[PDB]
Structure formats: structure tokens, C-alpha cells
Amino acid sequence: MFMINILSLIIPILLAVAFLTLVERKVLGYMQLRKGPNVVGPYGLLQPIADALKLVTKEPLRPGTSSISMFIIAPILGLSLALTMWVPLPMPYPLINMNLGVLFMLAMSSLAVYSILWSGWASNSKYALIGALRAVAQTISYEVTLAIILLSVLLMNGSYTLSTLITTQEHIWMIFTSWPLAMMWFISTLAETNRAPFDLTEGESELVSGFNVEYAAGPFAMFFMAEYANIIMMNAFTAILFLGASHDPHTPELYTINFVLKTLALTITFLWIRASYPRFRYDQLMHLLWKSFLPLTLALCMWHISLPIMTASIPPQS
Amino acid sequence: RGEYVVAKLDDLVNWARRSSLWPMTFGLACCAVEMMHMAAPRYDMDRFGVVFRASPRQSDVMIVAGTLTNKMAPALRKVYDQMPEPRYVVSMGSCANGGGYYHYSYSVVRGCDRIVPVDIYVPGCPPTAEALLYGILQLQRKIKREKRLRIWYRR
Amino acid sequence: MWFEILPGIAVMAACLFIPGMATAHIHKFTNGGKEKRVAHFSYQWNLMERDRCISGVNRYHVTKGLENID
Amino acid sequence: TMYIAFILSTIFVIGFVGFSSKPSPIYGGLGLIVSGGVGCGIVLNFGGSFLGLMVFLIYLGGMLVVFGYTTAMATEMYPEVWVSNKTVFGAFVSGLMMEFCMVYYALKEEEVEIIFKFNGLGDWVIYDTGDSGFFSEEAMGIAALYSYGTWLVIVTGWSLLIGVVVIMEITRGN
Amino acid sequence: PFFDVQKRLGLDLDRWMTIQSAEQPHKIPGRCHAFEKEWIECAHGIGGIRAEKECKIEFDDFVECLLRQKTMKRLSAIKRQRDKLIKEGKYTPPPHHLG
Amino acid sequence: MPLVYMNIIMAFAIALAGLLMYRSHLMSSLLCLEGMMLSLFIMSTLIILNTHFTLANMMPIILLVFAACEAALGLSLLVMVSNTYGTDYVQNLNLLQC
Amino acid sequence: MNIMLTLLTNVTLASLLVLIAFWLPQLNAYSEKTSPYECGFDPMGSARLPFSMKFFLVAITFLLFDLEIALLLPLPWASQTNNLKTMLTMALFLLILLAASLAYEWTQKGLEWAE
Amino acid sequence: SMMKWNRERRRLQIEDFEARIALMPLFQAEKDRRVLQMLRENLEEEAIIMKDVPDWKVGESVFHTTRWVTPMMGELYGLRTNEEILSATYGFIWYT
Amino acid sequence: AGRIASFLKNAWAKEPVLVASFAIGGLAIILPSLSPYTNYAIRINRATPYNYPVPLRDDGNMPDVPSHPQDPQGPSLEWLKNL
Amino acid sequence: MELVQVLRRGLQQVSGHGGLRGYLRVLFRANDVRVGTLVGEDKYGNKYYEDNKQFFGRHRWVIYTTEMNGRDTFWDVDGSMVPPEWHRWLHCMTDDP
Amino acid sequence: LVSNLTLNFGPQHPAAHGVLRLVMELSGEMVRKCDPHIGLLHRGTEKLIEYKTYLQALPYFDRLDYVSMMCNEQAYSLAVEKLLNIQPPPRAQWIRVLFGEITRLLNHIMAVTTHALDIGAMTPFFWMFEEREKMFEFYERVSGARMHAAYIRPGGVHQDLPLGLLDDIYEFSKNFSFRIDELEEMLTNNRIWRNRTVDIGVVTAEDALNYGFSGVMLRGSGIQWDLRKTQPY
Ligand SMILES: CCCCCCCCCCCCCCCCCC(=O)OC[C@H](COP(=O)([O-])OCC[N+](C)(C)C)OC(=O)CCCCCCCCCCCCCCCCC
Ligand code: SF4
């Protein structure tokens, strides 16, 4: 039965990724006075299937200068991390219930930077390596703000347990208590998934596709699935962290509906950023992180350590 | 018999391959702007599943939109070679078709079909975005009638 | 126009709803119709281990009340 | 399932043999992070949840990550491979066989005396029997860094600030 | 310390982590608290030279508590002697030891 | 002692041997140093958790942070050497023989 | 152990997706097809292109900041002590030292992507 | 609002902790008998297993001190089924 | 007067992020030392009963230790109920 | 009540295509379920529709025949199937069918 | 160890504005020199014109700046008319100015929107390419071709405007400023667009003059010069 739980978690997530491709294309199209996929199936509903089928029957050109061991290990690591990021998530009850769930997510997402450091190195070409190094530096630099923002927010939670976030946000959203940290967290999440003006590793008009140039068909498809799973997962984490839904122990379907709707709204906002802004330069986003986000994050961590102590509002640790 | 299963599988694979025709933006000259007009909202090539793609490693069709010069032909053949298969070439405009206005020039190759095999020849100088869209749908119908698995079953 | 984006969003919503509902219902099924007991600390684990021993059926969630002895 | 910490420790030592035989530093780093992951698992099996997750987040996702990033810049024109040297194979093979011989001896004898006396009676055997109550003893011990460990915080923070100053002194290159 | 600044200035800089029988958070006990306490109370103020011989029993008990080496030997003997009689079909473990 | 301790101490010995037996690259030796630190971390953690030395739970954190500071220093030294010679090869670090 | 089963399933399914992805398509490969992509020409290997001290410096500064973050992670449990004034003093001390490291790197060029 | 709520969550935790405190004498009394019964059952078995080992003497404390020593897992479950000792060692750690 | 006001003006006009961060950090530094509630937080932490309250033997002359949990002796949490 | 009228207009699009089968036929052939005014039918089976309240470029359309010159064209249609008489009206070179 | 990355490529790159080989060496992150390699679209136009009659050479100018077709053919027509000592009629001149300004709208839409798309603001490209499609319709209604009208000729224009064309041009133009507003609502004040354009590619006015710059590349540096005013045609 637990195996069935794992399967009924993984497979719907991959399906949601597949149709997130369609949803993103349609949202971009309608923001651009066009339609997007509306021919292949009703309202493009069979388009993700067409993409998945075409990709797995397309020739996966592997580079002659590629260390194939890591060339295939990188997609495995990426997709395995992208899937395992959902196992502690408290759609009302988690698959895996840990004391340190958000710490587990921080660690697992920090292991995901290897899939770029290994793909760029394995692909050789002597230039995709530079794009991979830029991506890794961006990822590790925004890990700092992710970690510190999570630390400051959880000082109202009292623990690293994600189920406790539901209890913490019973009467009020955590957004009303930490909105500046919410904006910085949301932009950090944007930057970590290489999205929006932070998509420097796959700049369509900067370096064509960067670290993913040599990957084609199948491994490219799995990398794409990993990225979109990470996008939906990060938006789910954001919804649980800042927009906690009311929970009825006798009707958890209500919480699930609430959470899914809020996660979809945040994902649609992620696609909304993509259609509205130009692209940051690499040094420009590094400057943003290091000289704008980091000082405010340090100050707000200070503030959120001081605040529960000076108001006798320290949460329980149980 | 077992030729019905092979025919159905061929139909499935050829529906998936023409429903996700991802082309490569080879905009050489004036024909490039009518192709991004077929990209524009009025025609919206994305509604057919025909996305705005990137590096030839994820492209299924080459659109030669513009004059090919002698200085430029080796690069066109290089990126054609780098396309994974199955791959198709659409020649768009008189210049790419057979040289066009510059047919008798010292520096112009007379038709991209001297460099690459071409599947569809879209006439016009430039062809209207609707003409290019017609060529794209005609290419889609070419893919629909391929019989790769039925060829294999009778080998 | 824009409401034709809604079918893909509905498919996404169903695919995202499935995991949470499945987790809740599997937890109810395998825990005696009640919520899966949470043991973050050794005291809760010891509570569950005592529960398993006294149930006689080696299941912590079979609850013995005052009908068992008193 | 009966033995989990022993497979984890044997794999730990195997990874140590792998990266300490020193192939090209990218494969050495891969071996080091495999060893770090299995060691984080080892200390997870001992109840050190926070410590193992620290291993992960800071060692494998921090320190390593930085190591592989820096190797990706200062390497060879053809970055080497494990196979390229017979010395790597010899060192790895000798380490693997000295692992196998000693684990077999300890398993079937339980009184080896390689420097230290050892008894492979199990690994669960040394665990004590008791309740930790309503808190993690590890977390309470580590959170005491700010109440009991004032001096430790002072010296560690000073050393980290000095580390920033020191790195900026050395790398200036004049 | 080479220069006992702590004992001159009355400061507790690192003596609090120096033994496991020192005060602990939430009064969580060390595993070998009593053994360490007895060895420390034996060896207090008589010098290391005297404490090495005159507190040997307490330190031996402490070391056994820390690394249960002799306990492990006795358990290993019981285990392997049990098997020594399973093969011959001599000893049947009782119901509460099999389920 | 239990056999996990045996394998952890064995890992430390292997890392020490790998560091003492050099090869061309400096990064390989630094990785051996890191392995030595990681084995020390795990040994300390096992000893501290097993004996329930609660205040000593923080010692592995301190060991990890200080050893990572040393690793940063060594990485900077390697980078300077490489900028001098284009490689991190230790055989170029021999001009102090005279 | 449930978590081990979950990790095994995730890794196994990812590798199976590799196997279908990397063996199912029909292949026909020649030399010029798999040549490295350089926008229509051949790439130059040159000699160890990934250089510049700034890429290494950001990694080192991230490492040191990550170490201080490791020092900050026990904070949610640290607020549960009776001796709250000492704990607050030390947590704020650590954060001032983080801010001081950032400021010192900032003022002494540091974080800059120079010429 | 968070002040109000976190203040309420602290009294609820005090109530839960006091429920545990009230229950603790029962659990301590039970654990003592359970541990003593397991130790004595091991003793009764080893009196049989060790009959023929020549210089063996059963019940012999490894420690010089006659003070009560809390047994390890090996002394408690060293003669029981792999599932039981696996539970007693890793059931809490693995429970997720 | 005008010098510090002008510096604050320039900082607010060109580096609002640093102004906000320094003000927030300064308040986080300063405000806890003035709060009446910091002592309350200390008291709440002290009143959380993690351990068992192991009893004492009344040797006589223990008139302030309760005897029973519901005797009018020993600390009271009535203050916490209304806070 | 305006969303009520939007839903009514959709439902009348279902009814305006002669039922659900006809609605799905035009949904899956033309990827469009608008109901226009029939201006005429050519000898090849193509039907031509105008709706002057649509914006320019959508106010006129053809639902292609399913059979033309011995070729099945239920799914496989193209703009070359429009005869020159209707080609002029369809591309708005004139206002007269 | 000077290994300045000599990435001497990028023709197939989507941001290469068509066909452009860039030979680039960087001192780490920053550009040290740019070496544009052109000729990838050299078709021998100037030699072919020598084999063409004066009328036969006019369509060659549509395909030089294939974003500003009618302006190129206006320039060629003005040159040929100056050599012929003849004068186009007033109505033809007004039509030429009107379609030159329509052409300027087309070209500026293409330039600004493709600049933004290369920077990473893809959305304004589509909104304005709809207006470009409408102006293509104007081109085709006057000449039968959407891009290469060949409409402005030495002596005037080929044929007169069809009835109702001025009304449609008026209908389009009365709404176009709202689209410029929407384009500016996305770019002009955006802190990311300005970060990618402010103080980037600064050219001195005197150095702009000595490098042969013209148009916006001159007036960007404050030079008050426009051929439509100083040397009107
Ligand atoms: C009693 C109360 C005490 C506590 C008070 C706490 C402080 C209150 C006042 C602070 C307000 C500001 C908070 C931080 C804001 C960001 C800081 C920063 O550097 O900003 C400027 C920075 C830098 O701006 P800049 O570039 O103009 O300035 C840089 C510095 N100078 C001025 C010197 C040039 O800008 C950004 O961060 C831009 C982000 C780009 C992406 C934009 C995304 C748009 C969509 C957002 C949607 C909503 C997000 C959240 C969604 C929901 C999530 C749950
Ligand atoms: S065919 Fe005509 S429009 Fe196309 S590139 Fe050639 S000259 Fe330009």
C-alpha cells in the first residue's frame, strides 16, 4: 500500500508537468495576443502527449566528446531529486513525515546543482562548461537567501516540520507576518529554477540553450521534466510556507483543493513573470542577490529572531 | 495480420512527429520577416504545435528563409548535418529555391537544394506568411503519409 | 478565448489533487480508519509500541478501552 | 534489512579507497560525495538526523560543489579519466582487497587486532535502552551552542571573519 | 591549561563541555554519568599518578560502560555457543524468544 | 569496538595514506584532506550519539566549519599556484630546493 | 524503511526513463552529425577556458557564508532556552559578524565583477 | 495575531506535557518490569546454553560495581528474533 | 542637524535597501532590551515542563512544597492563562 | 446574468451545429465551433460562412468538404481546395460571393 | 597564460540579426574587441544592377533594407529623377511621404521589438507585429505585395491609391499611439530594461560623426541633424 502511495504521488506529478508545458504555452500565447496550442487535440489537450512521443522517437545525438557515465547520470540525478522533493510535502498528510522536512528539501535542492556541473562538464564543447559554471554560481548564491529566509520564517513555526506550518498558519497566513521575506523568497525561488529574468543558463537569445545544447530528445526531455517538477514543487513549498490553507482533519480534500489551487496560482504567476520582463545580466542578478537581497535578509533574520522573544510569542517546539 | 499493428504504430509516430514540428530559425534575408509574421499573432504557428525552437539538436525542420551565399553555404550544411533525425528542409522564397533575383551572381548558390535535400519548395519573393504556413501544413501532410514501419515489415 | 486555457489548468489541478487525496486515504486505510499516528519524538514511538503490545493483534491502532480490562 | 550500518560503512570505505587512489579530481569528488552520502546515512541510522542533514547541506551541497566547481576550472587540457593510469587501478584494487580481507576476518572471527581490538558482534548491540522524551537529545545539545557555547560561537565567528579577510588577502595576487 | 586563565578569572570558557557528567541541557543524562561521576569522585585531588592505580576499578567500569568490550565478548560467546548447539539439534529457543 | 567504528577508522587511514602518497594534482590531495575530515566527523558523531554526550553534539558542527575554512584557504592557495603555472601540479612547487 | 523505498523508486524510475529515452529511438549517425555545435562551424578547444578569479571568489565567499548559515540553523530550538538574553546576544552576534563579512567584502572591491 | 496564537500554542503544549507527566509513573513501572523480565529470561536461557562451556559462570556481572547498570540492546534482545531487535533498534528512527 | 539629515536624504534617495536593512537590524538590536515581554518569554520557556518533576520526601519543615498537584503551594500558571 | 448569456451562447453553439455529434465534428475538423450564416455551397461540397460581427479576417470562413476529386478530405484539408469563384470572396478581394 | 576566449562564431544564433559571424576575444568576462565578419548575405547587387535597365534595377532596392522597402525605392527614385532632370507630381510626392512614414513605423516596430526580444522581452514583439501585419495589408493594397512593393518609381509611383485606402490608414493610425503606450508600459520605466540599456554602448557625438554614423546613432548623442529637415525631399 505504501508503494501505491509512492506511485500515486510520482505519476500524477509527471502528468502535471506534462500539462504544465501546455498551460505555460497557452498562457504565454494569450498574453501575446495569440492562442497557443489549440489544434492538436481539443484546446491542445493532446499536445503534451505529442511532444513526449515525438521526443522519445527522435535520435538522441550524444556528443563524441562526452563522458557518457555522467552524461546519463546527470538526468537521473536531476529527475530523482525533482521527484523526491515531493515526499515530505504536507498535502494534508505527507508521504514521509520527518522532523526536518524543510531541511531535507534544502539539502536535496542543493544536491540538484550537480546535474548542471556534471552536464556542462560531460558535454565538453569547452563553452557549455562556462554556462554551467555561471548557472552553478547563480544557484549557490541564491541558496544563501533561500536558507536564511527559510530560517527566519520558521522562527514562528518552532521546528523544521512542514506539518507544523499548517498549525502555524491556522488563523492567519504567514504572508501577513513576513511579506518582505515572501517577496525575496519568491524571487529567490524564481532564480533557483533558472526561470524568468534569471534563465541565464538557457538564454534563448544569449547562448541558445546553454548547458542543454548537446542534450537531445530523451535526456533533454527528462531534464525538462526535472525543471518543471522543481517549478511546481517550489510553488507548492511557497504556498505551504506563506499561504497556509485551513485544514479539516475529517475533510482533508478541502485542504488538498485549497493547496492545489494556490500552487496553480503561484505557478501561473511564474509563467506570468516569463511574459512580462526582460532578462537580467549575469552580473546584474549576482549584484541583486549579493548587495540587495542579502543585507535585507540578514536584517530580517535579526528582526525575526528578536521579535518572538520581545513579544513572548515564541512557538512551541513540539 | 501483423501489418495492421505496424500500420497503427506508424500512424501514431507520424501523428506525433507532425504535431510537434519544431523548426530552426534560419533567417538569411527578406524571407525571414515573413516567417516571423507567420509567427506573429495573425497566423500563430505555435497553435499548430510548431514552436519557436533553438539549437538544431531539438529541431525537426530547417526553414531556409533567404538567399544562400557561397560564403554562407558551409555553415548551412554544417547545421543541417547537426540536426537529429528525422529532419526536413523547407526552401522558402525564390532565392533559396533556385537563386531568384541573384541567380546570375558570382557569390550566390543557385538554390539551397545544391547544399541540402529539400522537402518543400515555397514559391514567392517573399512568400506571404500564409504561403509559408501552407507549405508547413503541406510538410505535415507529407509526414502523415510516411510508411517507415510498413517499409520495415516488408523487408 | 482565455477560458480555453482552463482545460489544461483543470487537468493540472486533477493531477495535483490526486497525490494528497491518495495519501490521506491510504493513511486512513492502513491505520484502522484513523489518522496515521505521528511519532516525532521517542515518547510517541513508545506510546505506539505500547499500543501494539496490548492490542493482541500486533497493530498499534487497535485501541483497547475500558472494555478490555477496565 | 538486519545489517544496514555495515553495508553503509563498507560502501563508505570503498568510496574512500576510490577517491584516495586519486583519479582525476572530478571522479575523486564523485567518490567523496558518495562517501559523504553514505556517511550521512550512517549517522541517520544512529539518531543523528540534524548532523547528517548538515553533512548533506553544507558538505555535499556546499564545500563539495565548490570543490567540483573549482576543479572544473583548474584541470587538464584533456581532463583525465580513472582508466588512464595503472596506478589508480592498483591502489583501488589493493584497497578493495584489504577491505574485503579485514571485513571477512572480523565477520568470521570477531577478535581482530589491527591496531585496535574489534568485535563484529553486530552494530545494534551497542545501542542503549531508554526513552528520550519529547525532544531530540541531539537538537537540544546542538541548540546549546547559543546558551552553553558562547566562547565557541565567539571563536568560530572570529575565525570565519578572519577567513574572509584571509582569502581576500591571498587571492589579490600582488 | 598551560596558563589557567579560566581558574584565575573565574570564567568557564570550555570546562562545561569537558566531561559528560557536567550539567546538561534539560538535565539529559550522559550514558555513563554514574561511572564517570564515581571515577571523578575517586580521582579528585590525589594527582594523576595516584589516580591511575588507586582509581583503576572506577576507570575500568567507566571504560566498560563507554565501549562495552567485555559485555560484547560475553554476548558474542552466548550467541556463538547457542549456534554451537542449534546445529547438533540440542537447544530449542523458547516461544518468547522466537515469537 | 563495533565494526562500524572499524570501518570509519579504516576510512581515516585510507584518506591519510592517499594524502601522504601524492600524485601530480593538488586538488586530489585536497580531496584526500576532505575525506580525512569527513571520517573524523562521522567518528565524532558516532561516539557522541552513542554515549549521549549531549553538549558534545555541537562539536561535529565546529569541526565541520573549521575544516571547511581550511579547505577554502587551501583552494585559494591552489588557485594561486595554478595562475602561476597553468596547472596545480606539485612538481612545479620545487623551486625552493635552491 | 519507507524513505529508502521512496528513494529507490525515484532513482529506479528515473533510470528507466533514461533507458527508454536513450535506447528506443532509431539511430543513423555519421561524423559530421555528432560534431560539436558552434552555430554552423567547428569549436576551438583552446586551453582551459574556464578561468578568472571572480568565479572562484564567489564560490569561496558562498562557502564561508554557508558555514555561517550552518551555524545559524540550530536557531529554532535555541529560542526554547530559559537563558534567552544570552541566546539572543549570541544569535545577533553571529548575524553582525555575517553582516561584517559582507561589508568587508563589499568595501574592499570583493563582490565586484571588475574589468 | 501571531502573538495571540503562539501564546495559545504554548499553553496547549504545557497541557500535553502534563498529560505525559501524569502518565509517566505507569510507563516507568511497566518498563522496569519489562526490562527485568527480559533480562531474567535471557538469564534462564543462558543457564541452559552455557551448561557445557567449562569455566563459564552464568549471571556474572561484567562490572566491578554491584550498582544497577542499565542494559544495552544486546543484553536485552541478543537472544530474540531479528524482527524484534530490528524494531527495538530502528523502529523510531525509521518511522516516517 | 542638517548634516545627518542630508546623509539620510542621500541614502534614502540612492540606497533605500541599505537604509531599510540598517534600520531593521538596529531595531532588532535595540527593541528586545526595552520590551516588558522579554521576561515573559523567559518565564514561558521556564514554565514548559519537558522533564518529569521527580518529588521530594517531606522531612517535615517543607511548608511551601505542595504535597498534591492541586494544593495551594508551588508555582502557578494563572499569569500565563490570561497572557 | 451576462455569464449566463455566455453559457447560453455556448449551449446554442452546441445546438446550432445540429446536436453534439455535429458540434464535435466541426470542433475536431475546423478546431472551431462558431455558428455563422451560410452564404453558399460550391459544387465540391465546401460550405462558406459569414458572421459580420467577428473581427476582420474571421468574419468569413469555409468549412471544407469531406470529399473532393476522389480524395477523402475529412481530416486532410488545405487552402488549395477553394475554387477561384469562392477564392475571391474568401480572401476579401470582393464583398460579393 | 593569456587564453582570452576567442569565440569567433555565432551566425546560426537567433540574436545574430540574421547572418553575422562575430570574432570575439574577452578579457575574462568583458569584451576586448569585436570583429564582425560580414558578406554572408553579399549577393552582388551592385554588379547585377549594371546589367539591368533603370526600371529593372528598382526592385533590387526593396531587398537591401528589407524592413524599409519603400524608403529604399524612394531614395533610388529621387536619384534617378535628379539625373533625369524631371519632377514627380505633387500627389505622388505626398503618397511617397505618407508611405515613407508608414515604412518608418514598420522599421521602428521591427527594430525596437527585436531588440527587446533579444534582450528577453518577447511579448511586445507580437503586439506590434499585428500592427506590422496591418501595414503590410496597406502595402499590398497599394501594390499587390506585402513587403517588396516596387511601388515608388523614378517619376512618381506605379499606380494611384485604391478607393477607401486613406480611410483605412486613418483608422489604423488613430489607434496606433495606444500600442506605443503599451510598448512603453513594458520597457521604458522597467528597472530591468534600463539596466540592460542605460549607459550601454555610449558613443561620443564627435566620435559618432567621425565613424560615419547617421540617424538615431547621431541624434542619440545629442547631434541635431535630420535629413528630412536640413535637406528635405
Ligand atoms: C514594524 C515592522 C518592522 C519590520 C519592517 C520590515 C521592512 C518593511 C519595508 C521593506 C520592504 C521591501 C522588502 C524587500 C523587497 C525587495 C528588496 C529589494 O532589494 O528590492 C529591490 C531590488 C533591486 O532594485 P533596484 O535594482 O531598483 O535597486 C538596486 C539598488 N540601487 C537602488 C542602488 C540601484 O529589486 C528586485 O529585487 C527586483 C526583483 C525582480 C523580479 C520582480 C518580480 C515581480 C513580481 C513579484 C510578485 C510578488 C512576489 C511574491 C509573491 C508571493 C510569494 C508568497
Ligand atoms: S526570395 Fe525575395 S524576399 Fe526572399 S530572401 Fe530572396 S529576395 Fe528576399
Residue numbers in the entry:
A (entry chain 1H): 1 to 318
B (entry chain 1B): 25 to 179
C (entry chain 1a): 1 to 70
D (entry chain 1J): 2 to 175
E (entry chain 1e): 1 to 99
F (entry chain 1K): 1 to 98
G (entry chain 1A): 1 to 115
H (entry chain 1Z): 49 to 144
Show the paper's wording.
A key group of these are the respiratory chain supercomplexes (SCs); these which primarily consist of complexes I, III2 and IV (CI, CIII2 and CIV) in varying stoichiometries, which serve as the minimal functional units for NADH:O2 oxidoreduction. Our structures, with an average resolution of approximately 2.5 Å and local resolution up to 1.8 Å in the best regions, enable in-depth study of mitochondrial respiratory SCs in their native states.
Our cross-classification results indicate that the type-A SC is the most abundant form, determined at resolutions of 1.8–2.4 Å in most CI and CIII2 regions and at approximately 2.75 Å in CIV. The high-quality maps, as demonstrated by discernible ‘holes’ in the side chains of aromatic residues, the precise positions of pyrrole rings and the Fe atom in haem, and S/Fe atoms in SF4, enabled us to build accurate atomic models of this form. For the type-A SC, we modelled 6,327 water molecules into the structure, including those that were likely to have central roles in proton transfer across the membrane. Previous work has demonstrated that the lipid bilayer can bend to adapt to CI conformations. Consistent with these findings, the membrane enveloping the SC exhibited noticeable curvature, varying across different regions.
